[PDB]
Every structure is written in structure tokens, then in C-alpha cells.
Amino acid sequence: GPAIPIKHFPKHVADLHASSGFTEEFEEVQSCTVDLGITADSSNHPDNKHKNRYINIVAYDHSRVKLAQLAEKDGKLTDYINANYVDGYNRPKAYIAAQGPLKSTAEDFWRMIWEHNVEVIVMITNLVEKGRRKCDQYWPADGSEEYGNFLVTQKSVQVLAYYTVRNFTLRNTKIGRVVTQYHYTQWPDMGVPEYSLPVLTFVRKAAYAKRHAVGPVVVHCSAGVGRTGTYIVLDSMLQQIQHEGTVNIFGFLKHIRSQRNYLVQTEEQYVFIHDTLVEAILS
Numbered sequence: 001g002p003a004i005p006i007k008h009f010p011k012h013v014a015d016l017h018a019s020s021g022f023t024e025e026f027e028e029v030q031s032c033t034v035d036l037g038i039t040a041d042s043s044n045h046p047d048n049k050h051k052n053r054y055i056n057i058v059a060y061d062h063s064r065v066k067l068a069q070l071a072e073k074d075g076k077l078t079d080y081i082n083a084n085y086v087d088g089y090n091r092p093k094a095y096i097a098a099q100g101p102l103k104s105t106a107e108d109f110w111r112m113i114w115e116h117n118v119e120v121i122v123m124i125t126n127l128v129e130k131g132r133r134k135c136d137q138y139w140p141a142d143g144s145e146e147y148g149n150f151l152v153t154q155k156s157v158q159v160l161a162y163y164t165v166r167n168f169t170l171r172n173t174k175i176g177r178v179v180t181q182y183h184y185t186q187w188p189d190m191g192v193p194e195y196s197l198p199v200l201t202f203v204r205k206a207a208y209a210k211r212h213a214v215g216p217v218v219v220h221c222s223a224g225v226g227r228t229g230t231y232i233v234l235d236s237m238l239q240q241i242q243h244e245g246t247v248n249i250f251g252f253l254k255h256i257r258s259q260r261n262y263l264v265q266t267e268e269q270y271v272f273i274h275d276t277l278v279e280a281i282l283s
């Protein structure tokens, strides 16, 4: 879509609400990648079957995050994690959009953080939400833990009303790096947040914290698509706003859809990005 100058964004969004035009727009987002030769052979390989948290959520072959290969006794692939490189506001591969690790993929996850020089994780889920398992705890409750060759140590935790920051060290014990996790803890278990400011605030604090990071920021929720996508669009659009005073949700989203399936999974989430940014702009 066109870049909308911030001055006209509130009206653009009010007009979408009044015309009920979000449904049609989100419907073009959903079909925007069917003609591009995208494949997901790795995600569907029998060796990887237990590494996927959800059978309908795959990591496209061209943009999937590859792990280095190991030759193990079982002879099975080891280059695979359900995650994808995703572009940001004029920064190719600014994010890794990942599913929440399982117990069986926590070592893979840490190995991805090591091999891809990740220093920030953004987590937008609780572990269990109203009886639904969303994500396994992949970090030590207290002190230290080993996940294969990866030693994670929790140096400190700051708890705030809407998110928590955990400060870890990561070591590859086959040979320290700081990794900071921003964990948003108040996303409702259904729907989208009723109030956008806490989410805005989280996004801004995270963005400060990653502002000099040389490698990608890992973003996950449970499937790594809906809430993950919503964060990615918010973060990138706050950058667009600051640097060009414009917003382009529709075009940006269509582009990242080529990198990972279902990023911004629901129309509600699409709408919530727009409402959150109107609010941001109006103060």
C-alpha cells in the first residue's frame, strides 16, 4: 500500500473501521504469497516431525534458520529448527520469528542463539495459558542449566506489571555471551489486548535494548506467527514512523508473509496493530 503520513493515519484507520474494510484488506494479505514457489520440505521431513509444535505451522525453506549439521548415531538431520529470518524496517533479516521451543528443541533453540549471534529474545506468551500448553520453559528457573553443549546462567530478573526481563549468560561448553530476554506476561489468553499502551511500552523498551544488536532478534510466542507477527510489524512500523513519519502496515506485512507463514494470523491482530499505532501517534 502507499506509505500513509502519520498525520493521515488516524483517519485512514477510522475509514477502515467505518467501511468494514479490514476484512477485505486482511484477505489480500492472506493470498499474497500463493504464486512464489515457496516450499517447506525440511519442515515436512520425517526426521523433523517431532520438532514442530504445530503441524500446520511450517518454516519455509528459503528463509528458515539453519543450524549447523551434526553427524549423530541415528543418522538423522540436525540442521532444522522451526524458525525463519524475517525482514525489518530497512534491515534485511532483522528478526528470527520462532515457535516456542518444546522440551525436545530447547537445545536446538540455544544452539540457534549461539550460531546466529542472537543477543535479545522477545517472548510474547505465557508457558501455560488457561490450561493450554504454549511454550516450554527453556531457561533455568534458578541459577544455571545445561541444554547439551549450552550453559545458560540467569544472572538477574526484573519483574514489571506487564513484562519481565531476564538477563542470562550463554556459554558453549565445547570450546560467555550476554542474552537478554524481554518476556511480555499479560497477553490475554484469547483475542488481543484490550489496551494497547502496555504493549507499546514493551515494544519501545525492547527496541531500546536491541538498538545496537548486530545479529537478529529472536521473537516467539507459541506458534511463532500471530503475536510474533504483531510484534514484528509494530516494531518495524515504529521505526518507519520515527525515520520517515509514515506507516505501511499493509505492504510491510505482505512482504514478510513471504518469509514465514501466517505472520499476523488473525484479522483481530491486524486491526490491533492499526489501533495501537493510531494511539501511539495521537500522543
Ligand SMILES: [Br-]
Residues within 6 Å of the ligand: 062, 063, 085, 086, 093, 259
Ligand atoms: Br530470508
Ligand SMILES: [Br-]
Residues within 6 Å of the ligand: 101, 102, 103, 133, 134, 135, 136
Ligand atoms: Br512444550
Ligand SMILES: [Br-]
Residues within 6 Å of the ligand: 111, 149, 174
Ligand atoms: Br554444538
Ligand SMILES: [Br-]
Residues within 6 Å of the ligand: 125, 221, 222, 223, 224, 226, 227
Ligand atoms: Br501464540
